[PDB]
Design a protein around this ligand. Structure first.
Ligand SMILES: CCN[C@H]1CN(CCCOC)S(=O)(=O)c2sc(S(N)(=O)=O)cc21
Ligand SMILES: [Zn+2]
Length: 257
């Protein structure tokens, strides 16, 4: 099965998921000089005050914090989006060293990690239907760099010991994802795909310009997780990122000058 190892990593995915070589694959490098300011873009609207977290889960590829998306509790709108998209989960991608970890890069710069807040377009009724549509998901991507601690990340970091191995989950209620946002909502946007199998081309990517800072100790705890299940040989969960894919016939738009 697919993973991030030498024998089942990104370079092999196309054999089971041929869309891996498709026309709107993610992630990509954001060339800041070629991206165009688009004054018709509207500000993002992130309304997370009513967000309800339920659970955190190690799924063998990352850890997901899952939310109740049975109603409009935590939603994203505005920007390039038409309609209302509901927050269903967030997760991270990270590296074995501070100089790598992000999926998107900026002028070829790699960050230590990348946060993905996954939202689905409510006009399609459920998440499973939304992924089959060109405008089905909106993912908010936020870069992490190593510096000062991010306080609002700490509750996530402290539960990681209870979900060390694949398939473990733990209750994770009353977590406020607002504590993971940077100060500015300036963004780049382009049409793309899931960055993991099944690699569906269903995503409107919204990547924030401003990284958040986390501490070395915070990221160190991400790297203590395992890809494997309990009682299998230990493999540290690190470098769970897909490299940049060709931009092809796409323009990246910027919300800011
Ligand atoms: C371990 C798989 N994670 C995937 C799959 N997901 C489910 C697909 C089921 O339906 C076919 S998902 O939409 O929640 C989502 S969003 C991203 S990313 N990295 O933000 O582009 C990856 C995923
Ligand atoms: Zn992701």
């Amino acid at each position: 099965h697919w993973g991030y190892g030498k024998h089942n990593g990104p370079e092999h995915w196309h054999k089971d998921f041929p869309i891996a070589k498709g026309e709107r694959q993610s992630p990509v490098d954001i060339d800041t000089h070629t991206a165009k300011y688009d004054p018709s873009l509207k500000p993002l609207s992130v309304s997370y005050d009513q967000a309800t977290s339920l659970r955190i889960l190690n799924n063998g590829h990352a850890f997901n914090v899952e939310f109740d998306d049975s109603q409009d509790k935590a939603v994203l709108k505005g920007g390039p989006l038409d309609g209302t998209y509901r927050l269903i989960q967030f997760h991270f991608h990270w590296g074995s060293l501070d100089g790598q970890g992000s999926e998107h890069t900026v002028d070829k710069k790699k960050y230590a990690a990348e946060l993905h807040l996954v939202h689905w377009n409510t006009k399609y009724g459920d998440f499973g239907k939304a992924v089959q549509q060109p405008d089905g998901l909106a993912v908010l991507g936020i870069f992490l760099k190593v510096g000062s601690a991010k306080p609002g990340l700490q509750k996530v970091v402290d539960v990681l010991d209870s979900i060390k191995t694949k398939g473990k989950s733990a209750d994770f209620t009353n977590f406020d994802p607002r504590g993971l946002l940077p100060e500015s909502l300036d963004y780049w946007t382009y049409p793309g795909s899931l960055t993991t199998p099944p690699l569906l081309e269903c995503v409107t990517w919204i990547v924030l310009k401003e990284p958040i800072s986390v501490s070395s100790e915070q990221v160190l705890k991400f790297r203590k997780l395992n890809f494997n299940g309990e009682g299998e040989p230990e493999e540290l969960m690190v470098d769970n990122w897909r490299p940049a894919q060709p931009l092809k016939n796409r323009q990246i738009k910027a919300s800011f000058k």
